[PDB]
Design a protein around this ligand. Structure first.
Ligand code: APR
Ligand code: NCA
Lengths: 58, 171, 422, 222
């Protein structure tokens, strides 16, 4: 319900939160495929930047 | 190729008149073809429906085909004919159902044939009876009926609507 | 760390929510039934709980209407609810990409990232709008990925010459929904139409009923859909309710004789009673899969699916190079045309007559409805076509500009009046 | 009697194929019709006819084309054949932009409005279809009349189909097969009866072609 907020330990608060760093982090550890990561980041936030930990899917 | 007309009974014929000599001629020529005619004079504008309903629910297992002459001058033709689309008349499935009419919208069924004419006995009926008397053991029903068309045109013109899937010979 | 294992799942669910939001907000069976949603552009997680509720109700509507599964039906249920499932794609395009598969839906493959291929039709985006899903065919054999799958056609049709088999344990399958038949074609193929006639013919009574029986006949088009959790029990329950209605020796002699060998004896029971479909939400990207060449691929399929390596393998002379050029003239494949022009040296007389199988002359083919402006421009610039020559066999007395104006193609009309007075 | 089909040239044939309708009408694409048009062209070209293929004509273009052919000189010709492939309703055919009535099409070919075509067969073949695309969940003919007109309707696209691209329509290809096989020893009415026997009976899982005939003689293509 709110643990997804605390998941974002890379606290880029009130900004793009280093979307490139998120791209790097996603495809290591769990071995995500690049064509999946691109869709992930595209649907993360449209129009460039400013997800600011929205988590407004709930 | 052709239909089958070697059943124990050739079929049933219903000649409905609405008010004469043409009806008598039709009775004679169809009894000549080993039919079973049931001539009915002027009926009520609704009486025909239950007349067809009574003959719709029968046992035509030994009957080759069905003929319903409608020699008249109003009830919708949709409900008169719809009793016979196989599902209702399980006995009459895969066998010809002829509807000769003299007095356009058309219902589309599996093995139905129609033959209309115009009010101005009658030249259409006289030509039909003469052609059936002359050619009944040689020509198909289509050729006989187009000869009727030629005769009527030489002396309007009848129109033929056919859904039959096989040829028809009265022998 | 571990937060990377949760953000990935969160983003996967968020992405999967949009292919369900599109289907539920758009489409009209879901407001003709009571399942529609409000259009939002960026749907939330409310597009998944709706699917969960729909699957729960669909499972209940059979589980609570059946009996009690006294002593034998539970074994058949357990052989199915504990089996191994693999999904087969069979496309004609190039998807292996060395060591990672990537299969995309229509709404993504045509999302301004232009490509070629597809087998969709009209209405699919109107009734359902499921054009943003990746479709698969289920296989209940249980044998591994490194095998030969024992099915080729889904309903009656071969979708391709390369089967891409994946296991049902992928993290991507967790948000895919099942349907016991084609979603748009609720019918089940006839017993005579069903594949592996050597099996059904052994039971001439079994195949007498599995020919027309649609599902959810309350609308003649509505179909029941089950999520990942409820997909395994639903197929077993529907199989049992079908069996307790069929009057055959299979019911006692074979469906409880397949228990020890759940290979062909189950993959031919379940793929004959039903024809299952799996729909993965947006993209199937993974490193664990299997590519099996079922049959060789034709020139038409390689051209239509812009399989450039396959096209170059198939084209070995000029007599078939011109045939491939005609195939690309139809269907408006610009990449195929460029590839063929970069390798072969054509002559103006090569396109002077339509080869067998083609019903139109050069100018009409170049100027017709779904024509390509790149190919038309190249033909006009290389002198392979006459801009002012009139048609002779169809619409005699008309020119290519007549087709351009007639079909309202401003780009083609402008290209046509650049190379001739017209 | 027969229709005396031994003139120098054997009639004139017109094929009208409509496949890409105007977006205003909102109609489907009618895939796989060029195969039907080519089949009909070859079938009637083998019968010594003069085929004219016309594709995607508007409502106002069909009437102009028909008026242009009714004013020709068919004095050396035996008959006249016209084929229509498009959408339509129970008694009307569709152009690319708007429906056009069928009665007005044949008025140019009346006995008195066309002196060159009298006592000669005038065949009209209609393949009309209408999809049940009601995206929420899913019976007559106004027929003209004259002495030498024959109509052959088929208002059915089939009871069902699969995702395979259609190879035409069972009606048209069956008609072409019977014309290829039997149309040198059988009359046209018998050929049409055999087409009725094939279609909608061997295509059982729904409509059936209706053959409206006003011919006053028998038609032998040889
Ligand atoms: N990277 C890619 N490069 C090229 N082609 C691709 C790529 N990714 C996918 N494709 C191919 O593009 C096509 C997408 O087209 P669809 O219309 O979605 O076809 P399909 O997945 O076969 O859908 C099945 C169709 O039949 C049934 C069902 O009702 C549906 O409409 C498929 O052949 C797919 O393999
Ligand atoms: N994409 C496909 O080939 C496919 C497989 C099974 C069902 N529908 C589509």
């Amino acid at each position: 319900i709110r643990e997804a907020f605390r998941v974002f330990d890379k606290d880029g608060n009130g900004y793009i939160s280093a979307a490139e760093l998120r791209h790097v982090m996603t495809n290591l550890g769990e071995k995500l495929t690049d064509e999946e990561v691109d869709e992930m980041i595209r649907e993360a936030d449209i129009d460039g930047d400013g997800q600011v930990n929205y988590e407004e899917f709930v | 190729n052709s239909y089958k007309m070697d059943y124990p009974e050739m079929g049933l014929c219903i000649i409905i008149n609405n008010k004469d000599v043409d009806a008598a001629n039709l009775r004679e020529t169809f009894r000549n073809l080993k039919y079973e005619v049931r001539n009915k004079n002027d009926l009520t504008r609704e009486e025909i429906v239950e007349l067809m309903r009574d003959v719709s629910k029968e046992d035509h297992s030994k009957r080759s085909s069905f003929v319903c002459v409608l020699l008249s001058h109003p009830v919708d033709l949709k409900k008169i004919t719809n009793f016979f689309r196989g599902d209702r008349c399980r006995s009459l499935t895969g066998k010809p159902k002829l509807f000769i009419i003299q007095a356009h919208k058309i219902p589309v069924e599996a093995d139905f044939l129609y033959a209309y004419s115009t009010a101005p006995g009658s030249w259409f009926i006289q030509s039909l009876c003469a052609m059936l008397k002359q050619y009944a053991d040689k020509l198909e029903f289509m050729h006989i009926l187009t000869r009727v068309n030629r005769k009527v045109a030489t002396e309007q013109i009848p129109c033929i609507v056919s859904m039959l899937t096989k040829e028809l010979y009265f022998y | 760390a571990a937060a990377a294992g949760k953000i990935g799942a969160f983003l996967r669910k968020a992405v999967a929510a949009q292919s369900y939001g599109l289907m539920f907000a758009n489409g009209k069976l879901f407001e003709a039934t009571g399942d529609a949603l409000e259009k939002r552009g960026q749907y939330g997680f409310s597009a998944l709980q709706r699917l969960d509720g729909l699957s729960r109700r669909n499972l209940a509507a059979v589980e609570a209407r059946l009996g009690a599964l006294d002593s034998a039906e539970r074994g058949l249920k357990e052989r199915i609810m504990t089996g191994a499932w693999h999904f087969r794609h069979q496309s004609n395009a190039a998807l292996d990409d060395g060591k990672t598969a990537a299969i995309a839906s229509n709404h993504l493959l045509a999302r301004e990232s232009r490509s070629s291929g597809g087998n969709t039709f009209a209405g699919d985006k109107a009734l359902l709008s499921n054009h943003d899903f990746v479709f698969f065919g289920v296989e209940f054999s249980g044998r591994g990925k490194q095998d030969k799958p024992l099915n080729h056609k889904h309903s009656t049709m071969d979708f391709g010459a390369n089967a891409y088999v994946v296991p049902d344990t992928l993290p991507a399958c967790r948000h895919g929904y099942l349907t016991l038949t084609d979603h748009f074609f609720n019918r089940v193929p006839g017993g005579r139409e069903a594949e592996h006639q050597d099996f059904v013919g052994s039971f001439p009574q079994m195949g007498a009923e599995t020919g027309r029986w649609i599902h959810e006949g309350k609308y003649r088009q509505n179909a029941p859909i089950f999520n990942y959790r409820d997909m395994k029990a639903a197929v077993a329950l529907h199989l049992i309710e079908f069996l307790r209605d069929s009057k055959d020796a299979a019911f006692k002699a074979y469906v409880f004789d397949q228990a020890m060998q759940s290979g062909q004896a189950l993959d031919r029971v379940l793929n004959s009673v039903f024809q299952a479909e799996f729909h993965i939400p947006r993209l199937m990207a993974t490193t664990d899969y299997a590519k099996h060449p079922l049959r060789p691929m034709l020139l038409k399929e390689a051209v239509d699916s812009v399989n450039l390596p396959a096209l170059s393998g198939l084209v070995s002379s000029k007599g078939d190079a011109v045939t491939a050029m005609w195939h690309a003239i139809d269907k408006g494949k610009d990449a195929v045309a460029a590839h063929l022009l970069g390798n072969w040296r054509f002559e103006a007389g090569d396109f002077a007559s339509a080869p067998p199988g083609f019903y139109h002359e050069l100018n009409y083919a170049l100027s017709e409805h779904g024509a390509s402006v790149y190919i038309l421009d190249q033909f006009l610039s290389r002198g392979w076509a006459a801009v002012n020559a009139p048609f002779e066999h169809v619409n005699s007395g008309e020119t290519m500009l007549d087709n351009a104006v007639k079909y309202g193609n401003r780009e083609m009309a402008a290209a046509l009046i650049k190379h001739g007075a017209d």
